[PDB]
């Protein structure tokens, strides 16, 4: 007699993983958060004085 | 120097306090103030556990100085054994209202 | 100052801060090794179907588990206290500067020869010049001579504050009625930043410290021009 | 057929424990050497090489010519 | 029917009324310090008094009139009172630590000296010494009252207990007169702060201990104590010796070493 | 403490007591599985013969499953111990858990 | 004074189902209602005083 | 005496799971909302 | 069979691999055929059928050790549902970004950071390891 | 009957239930204040206002978590429900005074919320140091309402310590020595001796603050010869014992949970465990000035407090190695409570180790008043005390209520909270080492990547708190009543059934001497 | 110390009444003579408005705010000196 | 532990309603305050 | 005689982080010296060492407050 995990475990794992990755990638990259990464290797220094 | 006028416990204790004080004089212990002393605990000489109802919890300290106590309900009927050391206990129900 | 994504201490600007860095590397390896060993045993205790559930004798193993930690704490404490005493050692400073904390800015007094004092306030974000650091620059920096032992004396004229410069290994509380002393010696010129380090009310986050370390002759002319 | 040989049947938990507590000890000495080299020594050598020929007036003149100081133009 | 000797207490409203009296006293002190009004405070002090009276009344009903203080219940109440007195010893340790901190390292604002410039201590050989003879004497008379009650002598117990209370009230009247005569006040820097808060909380404990002895005096007048069962008197005596020993530390430290 | 052989001899003794009762059979097995060992075939043979004197076929099967369980991931131990007990299994008509289908999850 | 504790032992052991704080008679209920009324009344007033004090009085 | 047993040794009813959801929502939700309303109250003063 | 709350003080049945012989049988009441089976178990076990032996096992115990020790798929439901609710949390952070937070300060504009980074190199921020040690002042570029 | 049972109680199990309900409500207040701190810090700039509103939220967050969530749940809730049952006693020694310890807490919490409602709140830090907390820099009623809220919580806990010590000393079966009482009962006995000796010294300090604010005393005001640093010695003479009072009942619940779900009849090394809790309680009174290494104390003082604080790692290591030895050999049950206890063993070890880093005063000059201290104490409080409270709540909820939780939902709740707390606090070590100060509503821009990650972790921890409320509703909504509990021979609190009757042990246990 | 005293067989009511009337109440009468002999007002010191005394950071919650609770006009000056 | 089947089983749909109402009870009132911060700040 | 003064030297009387008494003592010494010298018809120049050391160490508001209170006749130290 299959229980809830037997019947729906694979779909909850595959759906929850898919969902979690898609919504954190979207949040991290698409909405204007400023992570303020290191300028090293990234930023071309510019005259300020 | 001295003189009287203060009541004694014999005169004036009441309620449970008086019940305990009067049982003590009889050497009786209906309110479980003393630790019972073990028998050899064999099946011929079980520890006799008084109760007012049909079952009482026993704690067995199987060996002196153990820090773990083994707890179980002892039921009226044939003696039961501690599940750790096997020593025997037998329930002796009833009455306490003299 | 701190840089983005920084994981450890600001690089050392003074010999005591370098000592603290190597003492923290020593202590962090030990911290790493014991949390790893605990996580590993946990995993080892949880990954067998073999069982032993009868009473276990504790006395032998408790000798190991008290003596090996005692030996590790001695191995931490010995370099720890050597640094603690080295910082306290007598050193013959060349200059004394006082700083008084206030709500919400710092004043500085350099009164060994003439009566020099001034206030130092955060540059508001709307007034930063291009390239300047939000919340950390001040209008009047604490100019000091590089490569010289300086006695800093710290107090407050109101509530508690605390005067800190992480890259020199410095944090001394500013308490009204008390004059606390610390030593500062920078091995390099430059600008070295810190921030008030005891909650002091509405603008605690906005009363920073900026030291400017330069050669003595420049400090002497700057001090004359600030009179 | 062949009969099967008698295996070890006693002390299997304790034997597993001993083998892996030794293993952890060897691994802990391994990480301590690694860390002495990758981190602690690395740091001591970065500071000593930085200071070995460092010229503090040279470093000050570079900062001054870059405009950073209030007390030196 | 139980077969152990402990006391299952009837459901009671006094813990709630005592908690609400604490809310009304503290919100009352805040309205008095900040909103110019004593109204909440006197409601809380009144309900605190009513709670204390009915709770302790009910402990006398449970024990002298209903018999529930078997020896095991009385041994619990012994431990309770000992632990209570230890907590009060550590409350006064905080005020002794404040006094030694301030007096052992007098700051420039005091003149760098103790007693501070401008303070003129009381003479520890005048009313403070008299107060110390009064509370030591009261520890001797309450010991006489304890042994009289154990030897069954009602007249002498009451005589000795009355003398003890008289001396407690003498100390409190003497201390009230020295408060009024003293030329320094609680606002006279840390000397006046330490002196009036530490002797003031001790005076409060002498007034609480003397009220507890007066409860025992009236209970003894009503024959509540037997010659072997009288834990309320033993507790009041242990509390009274604590008030005497705190005063001996206060007299050595603040009135004599700190003058 | 004692040698292996001494330990085994006391447990063979315990289970060979002719008038062992059901409580003592259970107390013995549930205490013996607390130790860090799979019990020797000779201990198991005396416990299975105690089950036969107590007319308890099912507990004999359960003691064979407890032997397999105590061996953990050492899959060579149970088949060894069943080999050693094949003459007592045949003499007493004890079917193993696998012959009864009771190893199926 | 005469020892009247046995009279009070009989009163407070009467088998009338009263909890101890009400077992003395009609006095105890009046003193309980007084105390409870002051407590609950005084608590409502403290809540009114917090409302008043939580806003500026200009 | 008092009621004994599961669902009876508590000061709130669990006889109806939806009236219980409402009560638990009111209870936990009022503790979680109070600091946000306090902040709002402090911001609206000045 | 049926266990009742009012049985809580009686010896009870448990399946647990560390307590193989529990305090009571799984089934104590016996039908007529079951009674006859327990009489037949007093004779030689070689005369029991496989079925009869299984039945005697299942009167004494509830699950076998293979059954009580079985694995399950519950980890997939736990991990998947925990990733779901961690994913739901990012919705709450997207709502906060959109409705709660205003613009961040102007010091994070690209041009401000490029100038700020030049000034940090000019003041040799963290020149031994942390920051300016990663810039090549001879080449005027980040060290590769 | 409802007022008699729930407002006039004299029963230790119903008073424990009242404490667990009060602590759960205070945990939601404390969680909202934690989310307001991390919303302010989750992007650079200013969200709510300047540091006064911010630090009113930080100060209330701490007082609510410590005095209204952890102490009431561990000592008032689990201590009252479990201690009398684990010694066979029929109730607490002072069952009526026990009810006043509970009912003083709603008025203490009312005073705390009034302090935030009036004037501009008490933005002082939970340490309430002067002169910021004095009458010139915090004029008006807020700091006095905080003082009186701590006076009420102090009296509740001192009365409660007297009750627990008396009940554990005096009300065991006559044959049971204190070396036959379970470890959770030892942990509550030692926590109550720490409360009895430490809370009166906090009450003396905060009454001196009250009189400098309102009666013109000058204990902490140098103009009268007073000293702000004397308040810090009186507060931390209590405050170091206070953190041991927050973790010791947790160590006692972890020893029961690891023993039970390892299928063992006893914890490894019982007398070592008793020795280590009494050694930690004793050493915890001689180390307080490790919270004052930057105030200007003499060097030899700072060497003593570094050495004496490191010494604590020895007994605490004995407990951690003894919990690992209790798992060794076990028939391990991977229940949700065991997951919380195994999280606690590792994450409390990490937090305790960063506490040893901070005990070195030379290093603490650069780490004090930075987020490295906030990462240390949240590993031992959000991942230590709170993981022991969640392990004990899911382990004993079927005893208190008679109903089971859904274990799969509880495992989902543990997995979400474990990611959230670690996301929140691990990066705060980097913020501390790189110099971010405590009590700041905004930070220099370099600190933005780790403050953004730590506030994303705080929102994942909020999703776990919301899901815990639904899990408790689903168990009361479904009503799955308990049947058999394993290991009752070594866990006496379950032997009267679930939930146990209102009166238990009306006939005491029988325990002989032999 | 044994003190200078002697008694001990048992410490009973008769001995503690002997101590109360023969030692403790004579000590209180002696200390009462001694005090109620050095009494009578010694004369007040010049007023000096020292800033570590007569502190006022908040008005007192009674009176005019500037008098201490058991203010004695003869001996307690206000911050501005002795009362008229 | 062992237990009886639910006396009042809460189906998947009923769980989704209880979970959704519990989440909304925490999120809507705080969301309303935070959405309106600016209204309170400059007011 | 002993100029080229740079700052106040280490003083074994005050070897700890708290230097409040150093400042105080030297301000007292200076003012005591100066009162002795002004009295007996001598020269305040001999008091100079104390004056330099207190001016180095003491916050300007502390010296300002102590000078006001000496003028006012409320300075609590003995001079
Ligand atoms: C439950 C809470 C709790 C607990 C139990 C502790 C436990 C400890 N704490 Fe912590 N602490 C706090 C809560 C707690 N702390 C709080 C709230 C603050 C901030 C107060 C404020 O300012 O607001 C703080 C602040 C704080 C400071 C002040 C830092 C500063 O402000 O600059 C210090 C200094 O020494 C410190 C040290 C320690 C140590 C050494 C322990 C030790 O008890 C830890 C011992 C544990 C172990 C070491 C791990 C297990 C051991 C082993 C596996 C053995 C092998 C180990 C070794 C050989 C090292 N703590
Ligand atoms: C028990 C103590 C405790 C706990 C659990 C927490 C939990 C959290 N705290 Fe902490 N915090 C403190 C005590 C605690 N805190 C203290 C003492 C301070 C210093 C104050 C000062 O500086 O003056 C502080 C400071 C502090 C700061 C530093 C503020 C600054 O310096 O400016 C931060 C920053 O992110 C923070 C965040 C959090 C977060 C995001 C959590 C989250 O992990 C919270 C997530 C939620 C929970 C852990 C659930 C809570 C509980 C329950 C819902 C009960 C369930 C009920 C039953 C099972 C019966 N806290
Ligand atoms: C005669 C001996 C008996 C003492 C009793 C007399 C009167 C008031 C009662 C207070 C008792 C105890 C301590 C409270 C603090 C201060 C009072 C100190 C004792 C006292 O009475 O001090 C007086 C000041 O009172 C003032 O300010 C009084 C202002 C009165 C308001 C008090 C404030 C309430 C305090 C809260 C206490 C909190 C307790 C916490 C318990 C902790 C929980 C575990 C001294 O008078 P003065 O004119 O300054 O100088 C004499 C000059 N001729
Ligand atoms: C301005 C003043 C107002 C401020 C508040 C306080 C004011 C005054 C309170 C004085 C305290 C009175 C206490 C009366 C207790 C009466 C009840 C009692 O004494 O009860 C006894 C039990 O002891 C018991 O509970 C022991 C019980 C008591 C502890 C009392 C000690 C003080 C509590 C003080 C609150 C302290 C405040 C500290 C401030 C920092 C009854 O047992 P027995 O005596 O053996 O009798 C039985 C025999 O008859 C049988 O034969
Ligand atoms: C730290 C704990 C909190 C985390 C975040 C909570 C996630 C918030 C859940 C949503 O809160 C609702 O959000 C709506 C916006 O989506 C708000 O409507 C507001 O905005 C709508 C859209 O502009 C208008 O239609 C409404 O009238 C106006 O109230 C509404 O008030 C608020 O209850
Ligand atoms: Cu100044 Cu914080
Ligand atoms: O307090 O650690
Ligand atoms: Cu501490
Ligand atoms: Mg600090
Ligand atoms: Na911010
Ligand atoms: Zn036994």
Residue H27 sits in which domain range? 1-46
Is E224's C-beta closer than 6 angstroms to any atom of ligand 4? yes
Is J91 in the active site?
A: yes
Q: Within 13 A of K35's CA, how many CA atoms are on the CB side?
A: 21
Is E60's C-beta closer than 6 angstroms to any atom of ligand 4? yes
Phi/psi at C174 (nearest 5 deg)? -110, 105
CA nearest C184: which of C145, C138, C223, C137?
Answer: C145
* Alpha-carbon distances, residue J289 vs C178, E235, J27 (angstroms): 18, 37, 30
**SS3 sequence of J323-341:** HHHHHCCCCCCCCHHHHHH
What the block records as the tokens of F77 is: 């131990």
* DSSP code of residue E183: S
Q: Whose CA is nearest to atom 2 of ligand 7?
A: J240
Residue M51 sits in which domain range? 1-79
Cα torsion for F20, F23, F27, F28, to the nearest 10°?
A: 20
User: Rounded to the nearest whole angstrom, what is the distance from the C-alpha of residue C81 to the centroid of ligand 7?
Assistant: 20
What the block records as the tokens of J254 is: 């972890």
Residue A11 sits in which domain range? 1-49
Residue F71 sits in which domain range? 1-105
Is J119 in the active site?
A: no
CA nearest J183: which of J257, J244, J246, J245?
Answer: J257
What the block records as the tokens of A10 is: 């694979």
CA nearest E22: which of G42, J198, J68?
Answer: G42
Could you give the angle at the alpha carbon of E203 between the alpha carbons of E201 and E206, nearest 5°?
115
- DSSP bridge partners of C154: C99, C180
Q: Which of C35, C45, C101, C126 to mutate to test the interface with J (most CBs of J within 10 A)?
A: C45
Q: Within 13 A of E83's CA, how many CA atoms are on the CB side?
A: 26
List domains and CATH numbers for chain B. 1-98 (2.60.11.10)
Please name the residues in contact with J417: beta carbons below 8 A apart, sequence gap of 6 or more: J390, J461, J464, J465
Architecture of domain G1-58: Irregular (4.10)
Which residues of chain H neighbour L34 with C-beta distances below 8 Å?
Answer: 36
Please name the residues in contact with J373: beta carbons below 8 A apart, sequence gap of 6 or more: J358, J367, J432, J438
Ligand 1 site-directed mutation target among J310, J355, J361, J387, most atoms within 8 Å of CB: J355
**Is C19 marked within a binding site?**
no
Spatial distance between the Cα atoms of K25 and J128, rounded to a whole number of angstroms: 49
Q: Within 13 A of J259's CA, how many CA atoms are on the CB side?
A: 27
Is E174's C-beta closer than 6 angstroms to any atom of ligand 3? no
Is J514 in the active site?
A: no
CA nearest C85: which of J301, J290, J357?
Answer: J301
Q: CB of D46 within 8 A of CB of I129?
A: yes
Q: Is J433 exposed, middle or buried (0-12, 13-18, 19+ CB in 10 A)?
A: buried
Which residues of chain H neighbour G55 with C-beta distances below 8 Å?
Answer: 45
Spatial distance between the Cα atoms of C146 and I53, rounded to a whole number of angstroms: 93
Q: Counting one residue from B and one from J, how many pairs have CB atoms under 8 Å apart?
A: 91
Q: CB of E112 within 8 A of CB of E131?
A: no
What the block records as the tokens of E86 is: 């230890």
CA nearest B7: which of E62, G9, E7?
Answer: G9
Q: CB of F96 within 8 A of CB of F64?
A: yes
Q: CB of E40 within 8 A of CB of K65?
A: no
All structural domains of chain G with their residue ranges: 1-58
Taking the CA of residue J321 as reference, the ligand 1 atom at the shortest distance is 53
Is C207's C-beta closer than 6 angstroms to any atom of ligand 6? yes
- Domains contained in chain H, number: 1
Is C199's C-beta closer than 6 angstroms to any atom of ligand 6? yes
Question: Three-state SS for I91?
Answer: helix
Spatial distance between the Cα atoms of I124 and I105, rounded to a whole number of angstroms: 25
Could you give the angle at the alpha carbon of C196 between the alpha carbons of C194 and C202, nearest 5°?
140
Question: Three-state SS for J458?
Answer: helix
Nearest ligand by distance to the CA of J355? 1
One of 3.40.30.10, 3.50.50.60, 2.40.37.10, 2.60.40.420 is the CATH number of C92-227, namely 2.60.40.420
Spatial distance between the Cα atoms of E119 and K75, rounded to a whole number of angstroms: 12
Q: Inter-chain contact E117–M77, Cβ cutoff 8 Å?
A: yes
Spatial distance between the Cα atoms of G55 and G44, rounded to a whole number of angstroms: 18
Cα torsion for J419, J421, J423, J424, to the nearest 10°?
A: 160
DSSP output for M8-48: PPP-TTS-SSB-HHHHHHHHHHHHHHHHHHHHTT--GGGGH
Q: Within 13 A of I108's CA, how many CA atoms are on the CB side?
A: 20
Q: CB of C190 within 8 A of CB of C143?
A: no
- DSSP bridge partners of C213: C144, C190
- Domains contained in chain M, number: 1
Residue D62, domain CATH: 4.10.93.10
Residue range J2-514 in CATH 3.40.930.10: no
DSSP output for J232-256: HHHHHHHHHHHHHHHHHHHHHHHHH
Q: Which of residues 13-42 of H touch L (CB under 8 A)?
A: 17, 21, 24-26, 28-29, 32-33, 36-37, 39-40
One of 1.10.287.90, 2.40.50.140, 1.10.150.130, 3.40.50.20 is the CATH number of C2-91, namely 1.10.287.90
Q: For tokens 């069943």, what's the residue?
A: F82
Q: Is F73 exposed, middle or buried (0-12, 13-18, 19+ CB in 10 A)?
A: exposed
What the block records as the tokens of A7 is: 């019947």
CA nearest L8: which of J474, C181, I74, F101?
Answer: J474
Please confirm whether the linkage preceding J131 is cis (ω < 30° from 0): yes
DSSP output for A3-39: -HHHHHHHHHHHHHHHHHHHHHHHHHHHS--------
Measured between CA atoms, how close is M13 to chain C, in angstroms? 13
Residue F24, domain CATH: 1.25.40.40
Residue A12, domain CATH: 4.10.51.10
Which residues of chain B neighbour E5 with C-beta distances below 8 Å?
Answer: 16, 20, 31-33
What is the resolution of the experimental data for this entry, in Å?
1.5
- Domains contained in chain A, number: 1
Q: Maximum Cα–Cα distance for chain E, whole Å?
A: 72
Report the residue of chain I nearest B71, measured CA to CA. I9
Of I9, I86, I92, the CB nearest to J416: I86
Spatial distance between the Cα atoms of D3 and C212, rounded to a whole number of angstroms: 86
Chains L and H touch (3+ CB pairs under 8 A): yes
Please name the residues in contact with A18: beta carbons below 8 A apart, sequence gap of 6 or more: none
Is J479 in the active site?
A: no
DSSP output for K29-41: HHHHHHHTTS-S-
List domains and CATH numbers for chain K. 1-84 (4.10.95.10)
Among left, alpha and beta (phi > 0; psi -120 to 50; other), residue B8 is beta
- Solving technique for this entry? X-ray
Residue range L1-43 in CATH 4.10.81.10: yes
What the block records as the tokens of C17 is: 């801060």
Q: Inter-chain contact C131–I131, Cβ cutoff 8 Å?
A: no
Spatial distance between the Cα atoms of E197 and A14, rounded to a whole number of angstroms: 69
Cα torsion for J110, J114, J116, J122, to the nearest 10°?
A: -100
List domains and CATH numbers for chain E. 1-68 (1.10.287.70), 69-259 (1.20.120.80)
First vs last C-alpha separation in chain L: 58
All structural domains of chain J with their residue ranges: 2-514
Q: CB of J98 within 8 A of CB of J80?
A: yes
First vs last C-alpha separation in chain H: 55
Residues for chain K: how many in total?
Answer: 84
DSSP output for F48-101: HHHHHHTT-HHHHHHHHHHHHHHTTT-TTHHHHHHHHHHHHHHHHTPPPTTTTT
* Alpha-carbon distances, residue E13 vs E9, F4, G4, G36, I71 (angstroms): 12, 67, 28, 8, 54
Q: CB of C161 within 8 A of CB of C207?
A: yes
User: Rounded to the nearest whole angstrom, what is the distance from the C-alpha of residue J512 to the centroid of ligand 11?
Assistant: 10
């Amino acid at each position: 007699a299959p229980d809830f995990h037997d019947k729906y475990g694979n779909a909850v794992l595959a759906s929850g993983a898919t969902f979690c990755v898609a919504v954190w990638v979207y949040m991290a990259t698409q909405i204007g958060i400023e992570w303020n990464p290191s300028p090293v290797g990234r930023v071309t220094p510019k005259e300020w004085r | 120097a001295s003189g009287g006028g203060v009541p004694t416990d014999e005169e004036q204790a009441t309620g449970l306090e008086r019940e305990v004080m009067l049982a003590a004089r009889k050497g009786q212990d209906p309110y479980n103030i003393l630790a019972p002393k073990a028998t050899s605990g064999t099946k011929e000489d079980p520890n006799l556990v008084p109760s007012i109802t049909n079952k009482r919890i026993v704690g067995c300290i199987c060996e002196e100085d153990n820090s773990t106590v083994i707890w179980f309900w002892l039921h009226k009927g044939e003696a039961q054994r501690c599940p750790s050391c096997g020593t025997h206990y037998k329930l002796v129900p009833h009455q306490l209202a003299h | 100052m701190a840089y983005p994504m920084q994981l450890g201490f600001q690089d050392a600007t003074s010999p005591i801060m370098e000592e603290l860095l190597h003492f923290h590397d020593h202590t962090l390896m030990i911290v790493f090794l014991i949390s790893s060993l605990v996580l590993y045993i946990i995993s080892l205790m949880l990954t067998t179907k073999l069982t032993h559930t009868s009473t276990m004798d504790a006395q032998e193993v408790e000798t190991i588990w008290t003596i090996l930690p005692a030996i590790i704490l001695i191995l931490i404490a010995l370099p720890s206290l050597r640094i603690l005493y080295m910082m306290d050692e007598i050193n013959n400073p060349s200059l004394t500067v006082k700083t008084m904390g206030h709500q919400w800015y710092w004043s500085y007094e350099y009164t060994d020869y003439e009566d020099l004092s001034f206030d130092s306030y955060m540059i508001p974000t709307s007034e930063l010049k291009p390239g300047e650091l939000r919340l950390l620059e001040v209008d009047n920096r604490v100019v000091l001579p590089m490569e010289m032992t300086i006695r800093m004396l710290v107090s407050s004229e109101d509530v508690l504050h605390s005067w800190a410069v992480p890259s020199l290994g410095l944090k001394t509380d500013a308490i009204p009625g008390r004059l606390n002393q610390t030593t500062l010696m920078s091995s390099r010129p430059g600008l070295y930043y810190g921030q008030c380090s005891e909650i002091c009310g509405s603008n605690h986050s906005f009363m920073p410290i900026v030291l400017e370390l330069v050669p003595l002759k420049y400090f002497e002319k700057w001090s004359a021009s600030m009179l | 057929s062949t009969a099967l040989a008698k295996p070890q049947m006693r002390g299997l938990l304790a034997r597993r424990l001993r083998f892996h507590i030794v293993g952890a000890f060897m691994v802990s000495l391994g990480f301590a050497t690694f860390y002495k080299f990758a981190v602690a020594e690395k740091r001591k050598k970065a500071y000593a090489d930085f200071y070995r020929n460092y010229d503090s007036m040279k470093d000050f003149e570079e900062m001054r010519k870059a405009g950073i100081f209030q007390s030196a133009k | 029917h139980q077969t152990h000797a402990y006391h299952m207490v009837n459901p009671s409203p006094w813990p709630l009324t005592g908690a609400l009296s604490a809310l009304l006293m503290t919100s009352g002190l805040t309205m008095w310090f900040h909103f110019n009004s004593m109204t909440l405070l006197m409601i809380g002090l009144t309900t605190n008094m009513l709670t204390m009276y009915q709770w302790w009344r009910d402990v006398i009903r449970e024990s002298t009139f209903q018999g529930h203080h078997t020896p095991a219940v009385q041994k619990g109440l012994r431990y309770g009172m000992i632990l209570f007195i230890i907590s009060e010893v550590l409350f006064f340790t905080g005020f002794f630590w404040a006094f030694y901190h301030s007096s052992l390292a007098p700051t420039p604002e005091l003149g760098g000296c103790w007693p501070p410039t401008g303070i003129h201590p009381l003479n520890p050989l005048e009313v403070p010494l008299l107060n110390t003879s009064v509370l030591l004497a009261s520890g001797v008379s309450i010991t006489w009252a304890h042994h009289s009650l154990m030897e069954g002598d009602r007249k002498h117990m009451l005589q000795a207990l009355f003398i003890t209370i008289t001396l407690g009230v003498y100390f409190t009247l003497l201390q009230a007169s020295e408060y009024y005569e003293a030329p320094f006040t609680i606002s006279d820097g840390v000397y006046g702060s330490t002196f009036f808060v530490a002797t003031g909380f001790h005076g409060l404990h002498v007034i609480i201990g003397s009220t507890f002895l007066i409860v025992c005096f009236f209970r003894q007048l009503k024959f509540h104590f037997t010659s072997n069962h009288h834990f309320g008197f033993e507790a009041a005596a242990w509390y009274w010796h604590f008030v005497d020993v705190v005063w001996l530390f206060l007299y050595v430290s603040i009135y004599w070493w700190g003058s | 403490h004692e040698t292996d052989e001494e330990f085994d001899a006391r447990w063979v003794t315990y289970f060979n007591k002719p008038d062992i009762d059901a409580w003592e059979l259970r107390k013995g097995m549930n205490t013996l599985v607390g130790y860090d060992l799979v019990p020797e075939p000779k201990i198991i043979d005396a416990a299975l013969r105690a089950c036969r004197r107590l007319n308890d076929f099912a507990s004999a099967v359960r003691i064979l499953e407890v032997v397999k369980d105590k061996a953990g991931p050492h899959k060579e131990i149970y088949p060894y111990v069943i080999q050693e007990l094949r003459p007592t299994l045949n003499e007493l008509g004890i079917s193993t858990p696998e012959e009864l289908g009771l190893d199926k999850v | 004074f005469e020892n009247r504790v046995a009279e009070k032992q009989k009163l407070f052991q009467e088998d009338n189902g009263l909890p101890v704080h009400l077992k003395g008679g009609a006095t105890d209920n009046i003193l309980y209602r007084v105390t409870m009324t002051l407590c609950l009344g005084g608590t409502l007033y403290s809540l009114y005083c917090l409302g008043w004090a939580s806003f500026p009085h200009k | 005496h008092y009621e004994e047993g599961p669902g009876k040794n508590i000061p709130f009813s669990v006889e109806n799971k939806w009236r219980l959801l409402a009560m638990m929502t009111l209870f936990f939700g009022s503790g979680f909302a109070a600091p946000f309303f306090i902040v709002r109250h402090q911001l609206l003063k000045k | 069979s049926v266990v009742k709350s009012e049985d809580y003080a009686l010896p009870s049945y448990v399946d647990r691999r560390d307590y193989p012989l529990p305090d009571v049988a799984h089934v104590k009441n016996l039908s007529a055929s079951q009674k006859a089976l327990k009489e037949k178990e007093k004779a030689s076990w070689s005369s029991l059928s496989i079925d009869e032996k299984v039945e005697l096992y299942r009167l004494k115990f509830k699950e076998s050790f293979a059954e009580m020790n079985r694995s399950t798929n519950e980890w997939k439901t736990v991990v998947g549902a925990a990733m779901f609710f961690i994913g739901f949390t990012a919705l709450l952070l997207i709502w906060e970004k959109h409705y709660v937070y205003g613009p961040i300060p102007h010091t994070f504009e690209e041009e401000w950071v490029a100038k700020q980074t030049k000034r940090m190199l000019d003041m040799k921020v963290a020149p031994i390891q942390g920051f300016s040690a990663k810039w090549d002042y001879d080449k005027n570029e980040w060290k590769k | 009957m409802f007022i008699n049972r729930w407002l006039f109680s004299t029963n230790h199990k119903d008073i424990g239930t009242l404490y667990l309900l009060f602590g759960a409500w205070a945990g939601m207040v404390g969680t909202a204040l934690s989310l307001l701190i991390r919303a302010e810090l989750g992007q650079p700039g200013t969200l709510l206002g300047d540091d006064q509103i911010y630090n009113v939220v930080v100060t209330a967050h701490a007082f609510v978590m410590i005095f209204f969530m952890v102490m009431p749940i561990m000592i008032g809730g689990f201590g009252n429900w479990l201690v009398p049952l684990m010694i066979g006693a029929p109730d607490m020694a002072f069952p009526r005074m026990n009810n006043m310890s509970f009912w003083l807490l709603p008025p203490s919490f009312l005073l705390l919320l009034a302090s935030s409602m009036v004037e501009a709140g008490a933005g002082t830090g939970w340490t309430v140091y002067p002169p910021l907390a004095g009458n010139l820099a915090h004029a008006g009623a807020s700091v006095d309402l905080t003082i009186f809220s701590l006076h009420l919580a102090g009296v509740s806990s001192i009365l409660g310590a007297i009750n627990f010590i008396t009940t554990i000393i005096n009300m065991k079966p006559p044959a049971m020595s204190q070396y036959q009482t379970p470890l959770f009962v030892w942990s509550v006995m030692i926590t109550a001796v720490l409360l009895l000796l430490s809370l009166p010294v906090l009450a003396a300090g905060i009454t001196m603050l009250l009189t400098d604010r309102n009666l013109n005393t000058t204990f902490f005001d140098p103009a009268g010869g007073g000293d702000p640093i004397l308040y810090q010695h009186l507060f931390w003479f209590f405050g170091h014992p206070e953190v041991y009072i927050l973790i010791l009942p947790g160590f006692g619940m972890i020893s029961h949970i690891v023993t039970y779900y390892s299928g063992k009849k006893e914890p490894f090394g019982y007398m070592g465990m008793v020795w280590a809790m009494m050694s930690i309680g004793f050493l915890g009174f001689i180390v307080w000035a490790h919270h004052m290494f930057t105030v200007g104390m003499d060097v030899d003082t700072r060497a003593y407090f570094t050495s004496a604080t490191m010494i604590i790692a020895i007994p605490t290591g004995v407990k951690v190695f003894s919990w690992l030895a209790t798992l060794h050999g076990g028939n391990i049950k991977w229940s949700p409570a065991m997951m919380w206890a195994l999280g606690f063993i590792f994450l409390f070890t990490v937090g305790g180790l960063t506490g040893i880093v901070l005990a070195n005063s030379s290093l603490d000059i650069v780490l004090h008043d930075t987020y490295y201290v906030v990462a240390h104490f949240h590993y031992v409080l959000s991942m230590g005390a709170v993981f022991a409270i969640m392990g004990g709540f899911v382990h004993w909820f079927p005893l208190f209520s008679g109903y089971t939780l859904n274990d799969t939902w509880a495992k989902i709740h543990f997995a979400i909270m474990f990611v959230g707390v670690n996301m929140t606090f691990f990066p705060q070590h980097f913020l501390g080492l790189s110099g971010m100060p405590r009590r700041y509503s905004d930070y220099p821009d370099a600190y933005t990547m780790w403050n953004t990650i730590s506030s994303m972790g705080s929102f994942i921890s909020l999703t776990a708190v919301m899901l815990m409320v639904f899990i408790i509703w689903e168990a009361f909504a479904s009503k799955r009543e308990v049947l058999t509990v394993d290991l009752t021979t070594t866990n006496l609190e379950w032997l009267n059934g679930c939930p146990p009757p209102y009166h238990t042990f009306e006939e005491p246990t029988y325990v002989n001497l032999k | 110390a044994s003190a200078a005293k002697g008694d001990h067989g048992g410490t009973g009511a008769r001995t503690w009444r002997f101590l109360t009337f023969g030692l403790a109440l004579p000590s209180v009468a002696l200390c009462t003579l001694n005090s109620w002999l050095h009494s009578g007002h010694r004369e007040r010191p010049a007023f000096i408005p020292y800033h570590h005394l007569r502190i006022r950071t908040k008005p007192f919650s009674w009176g005019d705010g500037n008098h201490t609770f058991f203010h004695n006009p003869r001996v307690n000056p206000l911050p501005t000196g002795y009362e008229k | 532990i062992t237990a009886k089947p639910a006396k009042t089983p809460t189906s998947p749909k009923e769980q989704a309603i209880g979970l959704s109402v519990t989440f909304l009870s925490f999120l809507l009132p705080a969301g309303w305050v935070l959405y309106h911060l600016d209204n309170y700040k400059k007011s | 005689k002993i100029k080229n003064y740079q700052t106040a030297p280490f003083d074994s009387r005050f070897p700890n982080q708290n230097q409040t008494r150093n400042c105080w003592q030297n301000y007292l010494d200076f003012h005591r010296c100066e009162k002795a010298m002004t009295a007996k018809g001598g020269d305040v120049s001999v008091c100079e060492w104390y004056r330099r050391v207190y001016k180095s160490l003491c916050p300007i508001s502390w010296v300002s407050t102590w000078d006001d209170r000496r003028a006012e006749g409320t300075f609590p130290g003995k001079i």
